[PDB]
Design a protein around this ligand. Structure first.
Ligand SMILES: [Cl-]
Ligand SMILES: [Cl-]
Ligand SMILES: [Cl-]
Ligand SMILES: [Cl-]
Ligand SMILES: [Cl-]
Ligand SMILES: [Cl-]
Ligand SMILES: [Cl-]
Ligand SMILES: [Cl-]
Ligand SMILES: [Cl-]
Ligand SMILES: [Cl-]
Lengths: 407, 396
């Protein structure tokens, strides 16, 4: 019937320590933050272990569909891995192979100038690729309703939950302020968009909240004994908290005017990997095609791909829309009856509970999987898959030619 | 006329669909747009739309003297009850975000589970399955096929919106023919599995898509208010049979009827399940469309909402006002339905006394003593609830 011929996975790095630890973070709560023994922003051994569980699940799943032969190690030119220059992405590539193909010595490709940036993951740092600053800020602004304050009103109760979790009213930030209403984060730290030719940000209570709520998720996924000082009660409060993080990523990374430019190199790689019958990747030295191309990036990249392709989703049991180790999976299926090629898009992830418990993954106890819909495709299957040329042509429409990586 | 107490029973705000099934995929060749919150959960925008109703009510209740022109309400003036679902809890919070922003008023709920909103499902009482099914079948015109005949054009409009002809299900085909409907009554639930159940769910999905402000609503194939009305008549007709039929409605609405009664009649009691000290000036209750239908059926309240195709729309509020006549110190009850038009939901229209929310003036026919302007007497209102309530379904 339907045979799986090729897969491209764009994965967020696994569980990591917080990206920063600042005076503001310390002064928005009377409590002390739990410390992490790895440096800020690094993948933890537990983060690696959770990615290996996905690697293990994907080995079993790809083998059951015939993508990889049921042998000890995949054949030469079947599996290739690309990672961004950070330790977190590089060790996610390592960790994924430890699950997928342990003791096979498969290489993790990455740029060896480890000081500099890899444009596949961050093209707007190239000279050729810059944002039209007014167009981009205004586009994000109109997605927020015309003013950030209206976007803040939309998420009021979420900010109340974050404030309750931090015990914000009793922090140094609310020391001097006394009024009829509550001391609040948005009033203490008003948010306003900042757009430059190579970057977009929303500093204030919005950026801070995005960071803090992600830290709570990371604490939980890491298996830390005291998450958010024991003050998060059930999925409702988890999603109140992570709605702030998900909404900030929506504005800064899924807004088409930003996502199109930033997702272009990854879209070009995905397209090439699914289409060609013989090519040599020039920057890493990978002989495409391969049966499985695994790409280790960040949540920013998943959000850029989501916004560019117009993919919308929610992950059962996982409050972060772009969670640690979350995989956007592009599958090339061949219909046997006419040898026509079709593309299926999925999001493979672990629930927060399965991170917390380090749930062993298999075909019996599978990883979470959400079927994604590429609605803009012209030609579709009876089973919802985009045709190969419809998939490729959608990539042509959305891509920004100035943001291509021609090195 | 002095406004002294108010009870609001509200449907939760705009939410994602409650389910996503294979039949939903197979009745159209197109793909359904995905949502970015879990199935059945309130969207942030749904929360904002409810807060606009909270703002409107703050302005309206302040002008009428119920609440004081003040930053936050005084103790024991505003209380909130919500069902255990996230969508109702969030609706309570969103409502307070508009009524009393940053005042830290609590949303009460049981720590799907609360029998105030579902007394039959939780097992307080049960339906006599034959009596309920018979009452429904008589309202259907004898059977489900006869009811189908009364909504043929509506089914044709839905099939056109779905492009049903080119669907996996058809491979001349129609929804009622391809998916025959049959009534199912069990001790805790009634349903219409088949084309009726499906159509009731799909047409609500289109309304939620539109109210959510999605770019592609029903693949852009819902043309004119006439087609909106035709589509949601299927949704509304289901809720009429399955939720407004008195044999269903009176049982399911009993806990809410008792709460409304107690909130408007007492002089002082600490309510025993949520721990609310009644009376309050405003009691807000966050329920579902099924609850509004139950109350509507039990109280024999019929309404159509100008500009709003769903009779039990997102954020729709059944409002019970206790008015005092200062002439002879007589207490009177007034019933209204407050809501937002479908366009105002899509545009997120700021509400105020200048730009008011939709409002339908309702009248309780069955009460004995009545005002010149149709209000029931407080004593008669309590008597009416005593007559229509089903004691076995009390929570209490
Ligand atoms: Cl600290
Ligand atoms: Cl660790
Ligand atoms: Cl970039
Ligand atoms: Cl403040
Ligand atoms: Cl920032
Ligand atoms: Cl960001
Ligand atoms: Cl679909
Ligand atoms: Cl929203
Ligand atoms: Cl007051
Ligand atoms: Cl019930």
């Amino acid at each position: 019937g339907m045979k799986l011929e090729r897969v491209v996975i764009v994965s967020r790095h696994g569980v990591r320590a917080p990206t920063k630890f600042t005076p503001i973070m310390k002064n928005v709560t009377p409590d002390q933050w739990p410390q992490w023994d790895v440096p800020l922003g690094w993948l933890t051994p537990r983060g690696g272990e959770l990615v290996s569980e996905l690697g293990q699940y994907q080995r079993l799943w790809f083998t059951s569909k015939g993508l990889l032969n049921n042998q000890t190690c995949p054949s030469p030119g079947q599996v290739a891995v690309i990672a961004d220059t950070d330790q977190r992405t590089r060790k996610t590539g390592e960790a994924f192979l430890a699950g997928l193909a342990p003791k096979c010595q498969i290489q993790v490709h990455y740029q060896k100038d480890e000081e500099k940036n890899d444009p596949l993951f961050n093209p707007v740092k190239m000279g050729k690729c810059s944002f039209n600053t007014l167009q981009v800020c205004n586009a994000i602004l109109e997605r927020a309703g015309g003013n950030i304050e209206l976007y803040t009103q939309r998420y009021q109760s979420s900010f109340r939950t974050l404030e309750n979790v931090l015990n914000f009213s009793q922090s140094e930030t609310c020391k001097t302020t006394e009024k009829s209403t509550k001391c609040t984060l948005p009033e203490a730290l008003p948010s306003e968009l900042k757009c430059t030719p190579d970057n977009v940000s929303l500093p204030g209570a919005w950026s801070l909240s995005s960071t803090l709520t992600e830290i709570f998720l990371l604490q939980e996924a890491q298996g830390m004994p005291q998450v958010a000082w024991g003050r998060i009660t059930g999925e409702k409060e988890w999603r109140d908290l992570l709605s702030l993080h998900n909404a900030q990523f929506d504005l800064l990374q899924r807004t088409p005017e930003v996502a199109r430019s930033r997702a272009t190199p990854l879209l070009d790689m995905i397209d090439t990997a699914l289409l060609t019958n013989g090519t040599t990747e020039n920057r890493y030295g990978i002989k495409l095609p391969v049966s499985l191309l695994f790409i280790a990036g960040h949540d920013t990249n998943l959000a850029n791909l989501s916004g560019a392709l117009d993919l919308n989703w929610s992950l059962p049991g996982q409050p972060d829309n772009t969670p640690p180790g979350g995989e956007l999976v592009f599958e090339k299926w061949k219909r046997t009856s006419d040898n026509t090629d079709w593309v299926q898009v999925s999001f493979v992830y672990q629930t927060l509970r399965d991170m917390r418990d380090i749930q062993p993954l298999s075909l019996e106890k599978p990883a979470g999987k959400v079927d994604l819909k590429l609605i803009a495709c012209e030609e579709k299957n009876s089973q919802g898959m985009c045709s190969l040329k419809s998939f490729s042509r959608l990539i042509k429409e959305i891509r920004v030619p100035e943001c291509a990586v021609t090195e």
